[PDB]
């Protein structure tokens, strides 16, 4: 038909014929086949106004003017029905069964995809693109919605792994890359809106998570005794969901931002924490075990590093951009820790772990002697660290303290994540540690050795000499000293069978080449050693293996 030159009696009778079809509806139509008729009523409604074509106002064409503009408006509000319809095939579902079974998320099928983008390409054609796509970003909205609505319960709810933000944020993921894969399937490849659709749909979902989010964040912050190493499952989450939004385009971006900042600084204080944990706890008994035995503060604080080695990933991950300062007292002391500039890549997440746990490790032990030594030592100001302290007049048991829980600290090492978190400089700052505070128990024996080479010394400076009273004197001297020191070293029994070797190493050492020389340069000042020598240095010797075991 030539619509320019057709009587309004043959073109309203062409609109009835067309209209019969129509009222049949778009299945039994066909859905192309739907459109093309719309389009002819559509092109024959331009055709016939305007200004081009100028027909008569009577009523004979305001009739099929008005016809042609409602059969149109009816037939497309159908098409939008037929479009929603589609689209709600979908029901709202568990995404967790899904998950637990390992199944995908129901998806359309071709047909209905196809039927989708030639409704989406309609209506984009009659300049109704935003219109329909409202509908499509609408739909698709609340569905997804309700799905996440049998999470969000179990969600706002400390158990490695107990939360439903791991599962949560799993069914989060998935809607996310599906949806991705919806909108390629549904627009040509480079359709410019298809970022803009792709984000009407998350944002809403991204504006809800984040709220959860910011609550589990709340929680954390209030019962953070038992909640505090659940930001480390927070991160991943946040990680994950932010991983999987790469290359698209977001509304409220921000709010993830933001929700990035607030956990990297809770997990950030953790470590900070755990420092000023062991300060106040090695501080907060001012009295010392009677045993010298493992205290309170050793246990806690072992218990607590043994959680952050479970955590491994995390704390790892953790250290990003987080430094040594970041959990060191703003008071710190160098001689307060075992680190010793060997150069190490301090760019290394594992080498910035293990100093963590080392310099937990060294705060622990140096304020447990603080304590012992205010605690022994009221009115003294506290000389750490020194094995070398004449000021300080008990680093025989203070050094056994120290040591006795150094060796729980040792042993829950060894028994956890942590005895390979600390592989290399973590085990040898560890050692050496021990050795400072093996060298406390020591420190005693060495004055009491330098005391008798002194002696010798002075007087050893003229002709060998004959004074027997004086001489019988600087064993006299000695003798006191040794009885002295094997008495008190007998009420320190060590658990740990190496550390009691090198302790019986170091003392033998020190005393027994000393005594022999000291033995042999001045026996025969008399004619019977035996009555003016308490000990010959066999007799000594045996004193010393019977200490020592």
């Given at each position: 038909?030539?619509?320019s030159?057709?009587?309004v009696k ?53 009739g099929?003017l ?5 059969l ?8 939008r029905?037929?479009f ?15 998950i ?10 071709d ?7 030639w409704i ?13 796509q409202?509908?499509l970003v609408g ?26 933000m ?15 894969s919806?909108?390629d ?6 359709t ?11 944002s ?17 912050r ?6 505090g ?20 385009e ?5 709010l ?8 990297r600084?809770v ?5 900070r924490?755990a ?11 001012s ?10 503060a050793?246990?806690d ?17 953790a250290m990003?951009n ?6 060191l007292?703003?008071n ?27 310099d ?20 003294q100001?506290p000389d ?11 680093k025989?048991?203070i ?5 006795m ?7 829950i090492?060894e028994?956890?994540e ?18 400072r505070?093996?060298?406390?128990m020591?420190?005693?024996?060495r ?6 080479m002194?002696?010798?010394?002075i007087d ?13 004197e600087?064993?006299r001297?000695?003798n ?5 020191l ?8 060590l ?12 003392i ?6 000393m005594?022999?020389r000291?033995?042999?340069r ?10 003016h ?13 019977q200490?020592?075991?």
């Amino acid at each position: 038909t030539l619509n320019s030159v057709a009587s309004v009696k043959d073109l309203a009778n062409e609109a009835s014929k067309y209209e019969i079809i129509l009222q049949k509806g778009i299945n039994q139509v066909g859905l192309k086949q739907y459109t093309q008729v719309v389009h002819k009523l559509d092109d024959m409604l331009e055709d016939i106004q305007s200004g081009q074509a100028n027909r008569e106002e009577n009523s004979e064409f305001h009739g099929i003017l008005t016809h042609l503009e409602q059969l149109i408006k009816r037939s497309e509000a159908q098409l939008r029905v037929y479009f929603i319809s589609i689209l709600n095939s979908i029901k709202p579902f568990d995404p967790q069964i899904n998950i637990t079974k390992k199944m995908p998320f129901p998806y359309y099928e071709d047909q209905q995809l196809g039927a989708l983008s030639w409704i989406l390409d309609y209506f984009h054609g009659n300049s109704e693109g935003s219109i329909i796509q409202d509908i499509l970003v609408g739909e698709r909205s609340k569905l997804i919605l309700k799905c996440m609505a049998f999470l969000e319960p179990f969600a706002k709810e400390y158990e490695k792994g107990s939360s439903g933000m791991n599962s949560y944020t799993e069914a989060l993921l998935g809607f996310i890359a599906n949806e991705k894969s919806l909108v390629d399937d549904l627009y040509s490849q480079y359709t410019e809106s298809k970022p803009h659709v792709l984000s009407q749909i998350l944002s809403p979902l991204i504006s809800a998570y984040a709220k959860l989010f910011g609550a589990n964040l709340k929680i954390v912050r209030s019962n953070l005794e038992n909640f505090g190493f659940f930001s480390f499952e927070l991160v991943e989450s946040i990680n994950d969901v932010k991983k999987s939004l790469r290359g698209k385009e977001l509304q409220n971006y921000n709010l993830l931002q933001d929700c990035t900042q607030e956990v990297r600084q809770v997990t950030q204080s953790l470590f900070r924490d755990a420092i000023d944990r062991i300060i106040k706890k090695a501080n907060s008994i001012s009295t010392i075990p009677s045993n010298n035995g493992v205290t309170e503060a050793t246990v806690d604080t072992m218990s607590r590093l043994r959680k952050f080695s479970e955590y491994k990933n995390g704390c790892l991950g953790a250290m990003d951009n987080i430094t040594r300062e970041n959990w060191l007292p703003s008071n710190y002391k160098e001689k307060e820790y075992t680190l010793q500039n060997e150069a190490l890549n301090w760019e290394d997440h594992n080498v910035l772990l293990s100093c963590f746990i080392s310099d937990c490790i060294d705060t622990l032990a140096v304020n447990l002697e603080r304590k012992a030594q205010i605690a022994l030592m009221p009115n003294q100001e506290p000389d750490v660290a020194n094995p070398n302290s004449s000021k300080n007049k008990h680093k025989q048991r203070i050094g056994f303290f120290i040591l006795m829980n150094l060796t729980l600290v040792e042993q829950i090492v060894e028994k956890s994540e942590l005895n390979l978190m600390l592989a290399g400089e973590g085990h040898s700052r560890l050692e050496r540690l021990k050795k400072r505070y093996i060298s406390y128990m020591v420190s005693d024996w060495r004055d009491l050795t330098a005391n008798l080479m002194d002696s010798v010394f002075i007087d050893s400076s003229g002709k060998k000499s004959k004074d027997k009273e004086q001489i019988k004197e600087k064993f006299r001297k000695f003798n006191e000293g040794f009885e002295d020191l094997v008495s008190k070293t007998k009420q320190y029994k060590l658990s740990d069978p190496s550390l009691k070797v090198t302790l019986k190493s170091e003392i033998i050492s020190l005393v027994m080449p000393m005594y022999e020389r000291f033995y042999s340069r001045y026996k025969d000042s008399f004619k019977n050693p035996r009555k003016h020598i308490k000990y010959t240095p066999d007799e000594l010797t045996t004193v010393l293996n019977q200490l020592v075991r």
